[PDB]
């Protein structure tokens, strides 16, 4: 129907741009971060589930101030059989973060982005998110 | 300004049913993956599955360097396209080229992060030993993210697989290899 490469190119573009917006917002405009998530989105944060945009808003306000350094991004178009009639992209991130009052740490994060067509540009939002520190048991 | 991080926890499965399903999948998958011929995974991957590998931006990881995909660093669309493995044939052929492994399955920390009637997304955190070749007996740490659809049998069929491989830290090695005498 459409060439696979089209989906791969779309996935890379959406992910690279989204990741830049996401961690810039996290570090420098935390109150806007929840606008990057779908209303029903969840986050599993070091084994802790947070459900819904309003609960995500609260959780992000409670987290200390952050400085993230992102070193690795990979992404893939998600097969239509898993997300019928819905354009989605898996994004995987590795980096480090310094939270205020805490030692610097390495982390891995993955999330699924979904495309929301609009009168102007298609907007990508997080439908589901997962975050874990490399050294979470310390 | 706050400074408390919430308490970190182990595996998140959500429900007992899902814990059973995913833990059985991982048992079965890694019995083949660690067997010495991975072609048995052809029946675990969708015809149209995708796979890719990433490692830390930087070695003892040279066998993973040629196929590592970091779109932050690598900008060219054609090369980006070529490093993504697509179709079960190309996925499993790639996996069978990687070093032979022994994973500590029962120590995996698993997070199920998305679920619908058509989709399960879970990420697996753990370690594996390389069993042969240039880095025999080395301990790697990894994070692997799977998206699976219901399998026509009763199991899972993988449509997306992202593997991240790194060296285990000195702390991870110490914990993984410890076996002290019991003390009161």
Curated annotation (Swiss-Prot), chain A:
The Gene Ontology biological process terms listed for this entry are: mRNA export from nucleus; poly(A)+ mRNA export from nucleus; protein export from nucleus
Q: Could you state one GO cellular component term attached to this entry?
A: nuclear RNA export factor complex
Reported effect of changing residue 112 to R?
70% reduction in mRNA export activity
Kindly give the Gene3D superfamilies that the UniProt entry links to this protein.
3.10.450.50
The alphabetized UniProt keywords are: Acetylation, Cytoplasm, Nucleus, Protein transport, Transport
Top-level division of the source organism's lineage: Eukaryota
Q: What is its main location?
A: nucleus
Cell compartment(s), UniProt? Nucleus; Nucleus speckle; Cytoplasm
GO terms of molecular function: small GTPase binding
Chain ranges of the NTF2 domain: 14-133
**Family annotation (CDD domains):** NTF2
> What is known about what this protein does?
Stimulator of protein export for NES-containing proteins. Also plays a role in the nuclear export of U1 snRNA, tRNA, and mRNA. The NXF1-NXT1 heterodimer is involved in the export of HSP70 mRNA in conjunction with ALYREF/THOC4 and THOC5.
The annotated subunit structure for this chain is:
Heterodimer with NXF1. Forms a complex with RANGAP1, RANBP2/NUP358 and NXF1. Interacts (via NTF2 domain) with NXF1. Stabilizes the NTF2 domain of NXF1 by heterodimerization. The formation of NXF1-NXT1 heterodimers is required for the NXF1-mediated nuclear mRNA export. Preferentially binds Ran-GTP. Associates with NXF2, NXF3 and NXF5. Does not bind nucleoporins (NPC) directly, its association to NPC is mediated by NXF1.
Q: Which PANTHER family match?
A: NUCLEAR TRANSPORT FACTOR 2
According to UniProt, the name of this protein is NTF2-related export protein 1
From Swiss-Prot, chain B:
**GO terms, molecular function:** mRNA binding; RNA binding
Q: Provide this UniProt record's keywords sorted from A to Z.
A: Acetylation, Cytoplasm, Host-virus interaction, Leucine-rich repeat, Methylation, mRNA transport, Nitration, Nuclear pore complex, Nucleus, Phosphoprotein, Protein transport, Repeat, RNA-binding, Translocation, Transport
Q: In which tissues is it expressed?
A: Expressed ubiquitously.
Q: What is the effect of changing residue 18 to R?
A: Diminishes nuclear rim staining and 80% reduction in mRNA export activity. Complete loss of nuclear rim staining and mRNA export activity
Per the database record, which ranges form the NTF2 domain?
A: 21-165
GO CC, sorted alphabetically, is: cytoplasm; cytoplasmic stress granule; cytosol; nuclear inclusion body; nuclear pore; nuclear RNA export factor complex; nuclear speck; nucleoplasm
Q: Which cysteines are joined by disulfide bonds?
A: none
Subcellular location, record wording = Nucleus; Nucleus, Nucleoplasm; Nucleus speckle; Nucleus, Nuclear pore complex
Q: Which GO terms describe its biological process?
A: mRNA export from nucleus; poly(A)+ mRNA export from nucleus; protein transport
Q: Quick one: effect of changing residue 150 to Q?
A: 35% reduction in mRNA export activity
Q: How does it assemble?
A: Heterodimer (via NTF2 domain) with NXT1. The formation of NXF1-NXT1 heterodimers is required for the NXF1-mediated nuclear mRNA export. Forms a complex with RANBP2/NUP358, NXT1 and RANGAP1. Associates with the exon junction complex (EJC) and with the transcription/export (TREX) complex. Found in a mRNA complex with UPF3A and UPF3B. Found in a post-splicing complex with RBM8A, UPF1, UPF2, UPF3A, UPF3B and RNPS1. (Microbial infection) Interacts with Saimiriine herpesvirus 2 TIP protein.
In the record, the note on similarity to other proteins reads: Belongs to the NXF family.
**What job does this protein perform?**
Involved in the nuclear export of mRNA species bearing retroviral constitutive transport elements (CTE) and in the export of mRNA from the nucleus to the cytoplasm (TAP/NFX1 pathway). The NXF1-NXT1 heterodimer is involved in the export of HSP70 mRNA in conjunction with ALYREF/THOC4 and THOC5 components of the TREX complex. ALYREF/THOC4-bound mRNA is thought to be transferred to the NXF1-NXT1 heterodimer for export.
User: What does the entry's free-text domain comment contain?
Assistant: The minimal CTE binding domain consists of an RNP-type RNA binding domain (RBD) and leucine-rich repeats. The nucleoporin binding domain consists of a NTF2 domain (also called NTF2-like domain) and a TAP-C domain (also called UBA-like domain). It has 2 nucleoporin-FG-repeats binding sites (one in the NTF2 and the other in the TAP-C domain) which contribute to nucleoporin association and act synergistically to export cellular mRNAs.
Q: What name does UniProt use for this protein? A: Nuclear RNA export factor 1
Annotated source species: Homo sapiens (Human)
- Report the gene name: NXF1
């Amino acid at each position: 129907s459409v060439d696979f490469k089209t989906y791969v190119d779309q996935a890379c573009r959406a992910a690279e741009e989204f990741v830049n917006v996401y961690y810039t917002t996290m570090d420098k405009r935390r109150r806007l971060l929840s606008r990057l998530y779908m209303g029903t989105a969840t986050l599993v944060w070091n084994g802790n589930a947070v459900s819904g945009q309003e609960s995500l808003s609260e959780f992000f306000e409670m987290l200390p101030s952050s400085e993230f350094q992102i070193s690795v991004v990979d992404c893939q178009p998600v097969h239509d059989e898993a997300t019928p009639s819905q354009t989605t992209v898996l994004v995987v991130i590795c980096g480090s973060v310094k939270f205020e009052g805490n030692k610097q740490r390495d982390f891995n994060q993955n999330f699924i982005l979904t495309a929301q067509a609009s009168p102007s540009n298609t907007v990508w939002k997080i439908a589901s998110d997962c975050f874990r520190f490399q050294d979470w048991a310390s | 300004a706050p400074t408390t991080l919430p308490p970190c926890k182990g595996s998140y499965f959500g429900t007992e049913n899902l814990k059973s399903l995913v833990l059985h999948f991982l048992q079965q998958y890694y019995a083949i993956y660690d067997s010495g011929d991975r072609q048995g995974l052809l029946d675990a991957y969708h015809d149209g599955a995708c796979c890719s590998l990433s490692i830390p931006f930087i070695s003892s990881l040279a066998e993973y360097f040629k196929d590592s995909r970091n779109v932050k660093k690598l900008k060219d669309p054609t090369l980006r396209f070529r490093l993504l493995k697509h179709t079960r044939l190309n996925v499993v052929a790639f996996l069978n080229e990687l070093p032979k492994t022994q994973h500590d399955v029962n120590s995996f920390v698993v997070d199920i992060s998305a679920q619908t009637s058509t989709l399960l997304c879970f990420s697996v955190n753990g370690v594996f030993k390389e069993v042969d070749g240039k880095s025999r007996d080395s301990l790697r740490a990894f994070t692997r993210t799977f998206i699976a659809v219901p399998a026509s049998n009763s199991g899972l069929c993988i449509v997306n697989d992202e593997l991240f491989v790194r060296n285990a830290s000195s702390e991870e090695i110490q914990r993984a290899f410890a076996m002290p005498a019991p003390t009161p």
